[PDB]
């Protein structure tokens with residue numbers, strides 16, 4: 025699966041106890057849950073200064089998922105982070121990364137329970153004139 | 159083993175000697191080591207002006223490593239000087255150097271004892287608009303061992319972190335500075351046999367002192383290790399000519 | 405016997421005298437032998453600039469083997485030249501490539517001594533996209549001696565190492581040096597009889613010296629092992645060629661002149677006349693440029709020094725032209741090109757008018773890889789690489805920012821200017837003319853047309869304030885052009901009127917120029933706006949003569965020729981009707 029190559033199963037890291045706990049931040053966690061629970065465009069994004077726990081909050085919700093302290097939509101979820109490698113593995117063979125990325129997204133949508141994708145450094149996909157953003 | 163195609167094994171050189179003695183830098187070394195011995199942010203930097211022993215420190219720690227004069231964590235560690243072609247070998251085809259950088263970190267990350275990189279010029283990676291522009295390829299894994307000692311002048315440092323913002327939250331600056339005049343002499347003394355051998359001449363101990371004092375009171379634009387050493391080397395070359403002339 | 409199908413026996417070639425002997429390469433040869441004598445890292449790699457004797461060493465090795473100057477350990481070996489057909493003989497059938505390398509890589513050790521393979525171009529192995537293109541057979545089998553000697557360009561070595569890795573670990577890199585002129589000549593002497601025999605001509609020993617020495621000075625783009633030979637072989641051919649059209653190689657009359665025909669550099673043509681090259685220069689520059697005689701002589705003399713290569717090998721003729729605008733600060737430069745290349749348009753104009761330290765160097769020298777657009781060299785690199793003794797003009801070099809001035813510092817003293825590409829130019833044989841308006845503040849006092857000593861110092865003051873002395877100290881001469889005395893103006897008016905005739909395409913209408921002294925004085929007197937130099941003379945002519953002429957032409961009041969008279973500054977000259 026492309027998810028095993030270009031992503032990290034954050035849920036599994038949480039499952040293994042490898043992640044630090046989120047202490048409180050309930051308002052932020054609840055906000056991301058409500059957004060994830062939306063009918064359309066269910067894509068929250070954490071905005072703030074660096075060094076304030078944004079990534080930690082997402083790892084936090086992963087833990088809430090691990091222990092089923094989330095809506096049923098999220099109880100069945102598996103959270104993957106997106107590696108920059110989807111693109112940074114190279115674009116020799118024009119369109120190669122576009123296909124790799126299209127590929128993993130296909131697998132994410134395709135049937136296998138609710139898959140949630142965390143893309144750290146989301147501005148990474150701005151793209152030089154979009155295009156690399158694709 | 160991508161690392162072996164790009165980096166110099168400082169440890170192997172130290173194992174074989176072929177290094178200058180390192181003088182007075184024990185504390186810079188202790189600090190370097192202390193940071194490397196950290197649980198997470200084990201990424202110290204040798205920072206100052208050119209010609210102040212920043213790479214001397216590395217030869218120094220390489221030797222301390224060879225002789226197990228380092229903490230448990232470093233006892234069996236190895237160190238590699240990288241930069242260079244790692245960013246330019248991929249002169250064609252998108253993502254090629256990026257693959258190398260990643261491959262190197264992979265090689266370092268997995269199994270093969272504790273490998274520490276030495277970046278001689280971190281500013282060269284800079285993070286040229288981030289967006290996978292070299293320096294930016296690192297941060298994801300700066301917690302994942304991949305210990306690295308960096309190096310930069312203060313102008314270069316300030317330029318990097320001001321433009322980046324993350325490196326100054328990932329790396330441990332260690333001030334490296336020119337020695338006192340007497341310490342300079344001790345350094346010159348330590349390198350004295352190197353110059354004497356290559357030029358086939360002697361250096362008076364008082365010449366080492368003169369070069370150290372002179373540099374301090376003569377060349378305001380050159381830091382004492384290089385400044386005094388250049389006064390010594392330049393002088394040695396002149397003497398070697400006299401030696402050859404007879 | 406794959407080797408008998410795909411490779412050349414280099415010791416066969418040695419025994420048959422098909423290879424040239426080598427001189428001075430003995431230590432480098434010994435190095436390759438000593439590497440072969442190793443159990444590990446037994447494969448030497450000859451690395452250097454293109455042409456730096458890399459295969460000369462190999463060809464030399466073959467001879468050293470048959471001559472027994474090689475340890476018996478290695479002497480008993482045979483040498484073969486491989487690759488190319490070794491692979492391309494197959495095509496269809498996946499894996500044939502391995503099958504082609506495989507029996508070679510077996511026969512190489514099967515009883516019939518050890519065969520050393522020569523891959524003159526190691527860099528052409530590894531695989532185009534890797535593709536496990538039989539290159540894997542080498543490392544895989546490399547433990548069994550299978551000794552290989554190869555070579556690569558310094559640039560290519562870098563590529564080999566980065567592309568494969570294992571090759572760096574398997575091969576012993578060896579630097580191969582470029583010989584000095586003295587060493588080069590020794591090489592040439594060894595090969596001298598080959599050329600004399602091949603062409604049926606003799607070569608003077610001084611000619612060989614000349615080729616090496618001359619090449620070192622005038623062929624900076626080619627390494628001596630080749631450059632010196634190119635001059636010898638080309639020259640020998642030139643002798644045989646002329647002879648055998650419908651003797652010997654002379655140091656001067658053949659080689660010096662040959663090199664000049666090949667590279668340009670008039671000074672090495674050792675021309676028969678410094679009258680029809682220098683004397684006429686002063687006369688003709690003076691004929692067209694009136695006044696500024698001082699400048700003309702300064703240039704002519706600076707140019708004179710380049711004759712026969714007497715001028716400093718690292719310094720372009722160089723000038724800085726100061727003075728009143730309209731005094732010919734750039735016109736002289738064009739006329740110099742007008743003389744040098746017999747064509748004013750051959751001057752390389754450098755648009756210094758447009759400079760910013762952030763673009764100023766890059767538009768001249770271009771940039772490095774990774775930047776939008778390489779086509780380096782807009783004004784300097786792209787011209788100097790092709791025109792070794794061109795003349796450059798910097799129109800207002802004074803507008804340059806220090807970065808350009810730095811380029812000029814190199815240009816003016818050891819002009820091995822480095823292009824953005826990373827490759828140098830070496831333009832010491834060019835002529836550099838630069839201009840500035842700094843003296844305007846003093847020369848406009850009008851106190852004497854010939855620059856006076858007070859004025860001179862004030863002007864030079866400004867120059868020294870503006871440019872760092874480091875620049876000024878590298879200029880052959882700094883000349884402040886003289887102002888156009890009325891005396892000059894009368895001569896100039898005639899010249900200008902003739903110039904107008906000369907440029908008038910197909911002169912159906914042509915000037916009679918019935919100037920008479922009265923209109924000569926009119927143009928010379930009323931056009932003498934001293935503080936603007938001669939340029940206003942042109943405006944006056946356009947305003948008073950050409951406009952009327954054009955109108956009469958449009959009205960067809962003139963069929964040919966061109967009547968002139970003065971009708972009566974209020975007279976406005978006024979050209980007459982015609983027909």
Ligand SMILES: Nc1ncnc2c1ncn2[C@@H]1O[C@H](COP(=O)(O)OP(=O)(O)OP(=O)(O)O)[C@@H](O)[C@H]1O
Pocket residue numbers: 044045046047048073074075076077078079080081324
């Ligand atoms: N419960 C928590 N709340 C806030 N921060 C925490 C918490 N637990 C751990 N942290 C630490 O807070 C730090 C903030 O870094 P984090 O990994 O969140 O990066 P960030 O805050 O998203 O900023 P960035 O965008 O530079 O990654 C982390 O280093 C994390 O170890």
Ligand SMILES: Nc1ncnc2c1ncn2[C@@H]1O[C@H](COP(=O)(O)OP(=O)(O)OP(=O)(O)O)[C@@H](O)[C@H]1O
Pocket residue numbers: 178179180181182183207208209210211212213214215217278309310311345383384387
């Ligand atoms: N104890 C020492 N060991 C090694 N080099 C030393 C020592 N003391 C002084 N030096 C001088 O300093 C040089 C390297 O040290 P230093 O870090 O001061 O230079 P640097 O500025 O680090 O180099 P760079 O410009 O790459 O940062 C050596 O080449 C040597 O001349």
Ligand SMILES: Nc1ncnc2c1ncn2[C@@H]1O[C@H](COP(=O)(O)OP(=O)(O)OP(=O)(O)O)[C@@H](O)[C@H]1O
Pocket residue numbers: 692693694695696728729730731732733734735736799841888896899937938939942
């Ligand atoms: N001494 C002279 N004899 C004949 N014609 C001249 C002389 N000086 C100037 N001229 C004429 O006037 C013009 C001089 O041009 P030139 O550009 O050299 O003036 P300039 O001083 O270069 O202007 P600037 O200093 O701005 O480049 C030319 O077009 C030329 O026809």
